[PDB]
Ligand binder design. Structure first.
Ligand SMILES: CNC(=O)NC(=N)NCCC[C@H](NC(=O)C[N-][N+]#N)C(=O)N(Cc1ccccc1)Cc1ccccc1
Ligand SMILES: C=CCO/N=C/c1ccnc2ccccc12
Length: 497
């Protein structure tokens, strides 16, 4: 019933705002007019990106921004709401460039959330900006608060939420209330920073949009799919950093929740969220990439998958060798390591030497250039069928993607997502989800339904015995136990009645 969210980032750099034009793609490749009425109808949210936090610890435009041109761009976006009364134009604060641990504005994020007075000044500036520019809600993309900063981040979200709710009442906006989201970590290493307090982080949000992409890249030793739905036992595996989070759980509880090593997949991130009590499936949104990540220096044998590679990891890209054959946008952007889906379609179609291959465990496509030794991991309308089916089966809130300019000209990726959720004639009941590796962790938030004989006082239970008691099914950790389940450390809660 409830419509799935379809949240697309609209990113425009300052120089493009300051020189905004809808009639020159060499100046602005993706002007607002490319978001046609048909596309507008298929989105529920557009995340305008990025604003920042300044040294005055307020939400702010990049100070080089021409304000009149900014308002003009934003006005074109909010004009789209004429075609879709469900559509929201959010704005996003942060992004990797501004907010990463070494980013140019990082200290402003740390300081803005640090004290009650700072949080109030910061929260106020967010709602002020929202009202002043005509936005419909606030998205926070801080990558990422460290475990020490998490309490301040939580309080900042809570305070923003109160101010948004006030604003909704003031504007009589109950039909389309102002919203709050974050872009959340989609991989266990960064997720471990705030994982233990995930319920408090998600409580004030309408959605947490998981960045379930960038799970492979040149910083890793071995090529891999950047957004595998499920795991491939042939691919690399990773230490499960969540088992070291400050949860206060027992060895058995930790082990059951956090297998290690594990496959870094979209399903892993989603299940890791669902394991936590107080994190509802309907607030979890699955991020998908509208771009691929490209690697060079790869060996043959498995289509370039799971190979060592010679892809520079430095930022900015360290020379002028744009080796991703056929990638014209890569030349424009001086970086052969990222290619939009729009460009990847053209690369396949041209005489450039790529084969499109498919991994039926991960349910994702990849390109392999056998002659030069290149590998590209990306997503397409086919991988989106499996991801859409997972979103529905797991009762997730919807899909998020980065970014709108990377869809092809006809908006085929966006149209596919909309079709999979909303087309009366689309049927995926027989779509086979495959035998790729599922993340099997169980935690307090995702106990399965079970039945077992009622616990009987006086009975001596062997290790592994299952009983039902006071609403749950419990398993003895060793034998021989006679205590009431939940009264001491001998029983593990394994299911709910
Ligand atoms: C919604 N927020 C996100 O999606 N964030 C996110 N993906 N953060 C991590 C990715 C940062 C990315 N870095 C690289 O790609 C490293 N280069 N290499 N190899 C980045 O900062 N940019 C490229 C990018 C961004 C998002 C998704 C894929 C690639 C530069 C950038 C360009 C425009 C806006 C923001 C960042
Ligand atoms: C490859 C270009 C540099 O951009 N890198 C971003 C980055 C660096 C290290 N680890 C990461 C993990 C996830 C996403 C991005 C990165």
């Amino acid at each position: 019933s409830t419509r799935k969210a379809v949240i697309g980032y609209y990113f425009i750099p300052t120089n493009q705002i300051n020189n905004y034009t809808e009639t020159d793609t060499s100046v602005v490749p993706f002007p607002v007019s490319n978001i046609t009425p048909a596309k507008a109808k298929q989105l529920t949210h557009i995340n305008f990106s990025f604003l920042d936090i300044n040294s005055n610890l307020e939400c702010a435009w990049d100070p080089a921004t021409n304000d009149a041109k900014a308002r003009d761009v934003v006005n074109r976006l909010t004009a789209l709401k004429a075609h879709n009364p469900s559509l929201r134009i959010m704005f996003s604060i942060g992004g990797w460039y501004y907010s990463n641990d070494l980013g140019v504005s990082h200290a402003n994020y740390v300081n803005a959330v640090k004290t009650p007075a700072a949080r109030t000044k910061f929260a106020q500036s967010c709602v002020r900006i929202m009202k002043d520019y005509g936005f419909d809600g606030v998205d926070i993309d801080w990558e990422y608060p460290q475990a020490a900063e998490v309490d301040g981040f939580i309080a900042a979200l809570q305070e923003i939420r109160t101010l948004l709710n006030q604003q909704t009442i003031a504007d009589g906006r109950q039909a389309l209330p102002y919203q709050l989201t974050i872009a959340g970590a989609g991989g266990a290493f960064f997720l471990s920073r705030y994982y233990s307090k995930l319920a408090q982080i998600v409580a004030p949000l309408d959605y947490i949009n998981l960045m379930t992409y960038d799970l492979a890249g040149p910083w890793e030793k071995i090529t891999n799919h950047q957004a595998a739905l499920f795991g491939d036992a042939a691919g690399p595996t990773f230490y499960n950093a969540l088992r070291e989070a400050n949860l206060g759980w027992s060895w058995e509880e930790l082990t059951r929740a956090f297998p290690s090593p594990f496959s870094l997949t979209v399903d892993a991130a989603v299940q890791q969220h669902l394991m936590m009590e107080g994190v509802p499936s309907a607030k979890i949104v699955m991020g998908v990439p509208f771009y691929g990540r490209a690697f060079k220096g790869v060996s043959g044998g498995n289509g370039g998958q799971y190979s060592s590679h010679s892809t520079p990891g430095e930022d900015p890209y360290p020379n002028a060798d744009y080796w991703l054959v056929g990638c014209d946008e890569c030349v424009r952007d001086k970086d052969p390591r990222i290619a939009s889906y729009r460009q990847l379609e053209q690369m396949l179609q041209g005489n450039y030497g790529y084969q499109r291959l498919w991994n039926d465990k991960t349910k994702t496509p990849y390109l392999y250039h056998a002659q030069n030794g290149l590998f590209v991991t990306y997503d397409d309308a086919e991988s989106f069928k499996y991801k859409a089916k997972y979103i529905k089966q797991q009762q997730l809130g919807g899909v998020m993607f980065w970014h709108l300019g990377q869809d092809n000209r006809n908006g085929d990726l966006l149209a596919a997502l909309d079709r999979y959720f909303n087309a009366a004639d689309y049927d995926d009941s027989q779509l086979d989800m495959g035998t790729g590796l599922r993340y099997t962790g169980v935690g307090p938030g995702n106990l399965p339904i079970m039945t077992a004989p009622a616990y009987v006082p006086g009975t001596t239970y062997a290790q592994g015995a299952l009983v039902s008691y006071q609403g749950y099914v419990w398993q003895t950790k060793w034998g021989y136990i006679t205590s009431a389940p939940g009264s001491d450390s001998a029983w593990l809660k394994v299911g709910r009645l």
